[PDB]
Design a protein around this ligand. Structure first.
Ligand SMILES: *[C@@H]1O[C@H](CO)[C@@H](O[C@@H]2O[C@H](CO)[C@@H](O)[C@H](O)[C@H]2NC(C)=O)[C@H](O)[C@H]1NC(C)=O
Ligand SMILES: *[C@@H]1O[C@H](CO)[C@@H](O[C@@H]2O[C@H](CO)[C@@H](O)[C@H](O)[C@H]2NC(C)=O)[C@H](O)[C@H]1NC(C)=O
Ligand SMILES: *[C@@H]1O[C@H](CO)[C@@H](O)[C@H](O)[C@H]1NC(C)=O
Lengths: 55, 49
């Protein structure tokens, strides 16, 4: 899918039907540094186990 | 946007889209050279059609 912005907040959605989700580390994958992509944007990637598990 | 269209076509043949975003200028140069070669081979060769 694609990263979209509703004006204020950034989400990820599938391309053929609008259904915005929170950008986590299960939605995305990492590759490389931030200086080789033309048009990269600063935002946060939420880690889905830090509120549920700090035992 | 056109580079996002090219990234998901790269995804359609089984390459990850970061390969395109990391080699974007090399890929655009290779495309522009290939169009120029088509134009030269049509501009001077007289049996193509
Ligand atoms: C863009 O999305 C954000 C995230 O949902 C919206 O912010 C929320 O707005 C609702 C209703 O006003 C609030 O109940 C939530 O508390 C807000 N969330 C946060 C994290 O602030 C935002 O309003 C959206 N913008 C537009 C123009 O639709
Ligand atoms: C996105 O965030 C990065 C990191 O916070 C910013 O990069 C910094 O940019 C300043 C000058 O603008 C440099 O002096 C810092 O050394 C940079 N930090 C790093 C870690 O390299 C970047 O400017 C931000 N971009 C936008 C558009 O806000
Ligand atoms: C989009 O165009 C603006 C100029 O209008 C430019 O500053 C920006 O870098 C461009 N973004 C991308 C991803 O090419």
């Amino acid at each position: 899918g694609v990263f979209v912005s509703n004006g204020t907040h950034w989400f990820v959605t599938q391309r053929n039907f609008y259904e915005p989700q929170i950008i986590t580390t299960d939605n995305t994958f990492v590759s490389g540094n931030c200086d080789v992509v033309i048009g990269i944007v600063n935002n946060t990637v939420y880690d889905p186990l830090q509120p549920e598990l700090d035992s | 946007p056109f580079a996002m269209q090219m990234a998901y076509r790269f995804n359609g043949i089984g390459v990850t889209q970061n390969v395109l975003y990391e080699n974007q200028k090399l890929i655009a140069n290779q495309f522009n050279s290939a169009i120029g070669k088509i134009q030269d081979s049509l501009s001077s060769t007289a049996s193509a059609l």
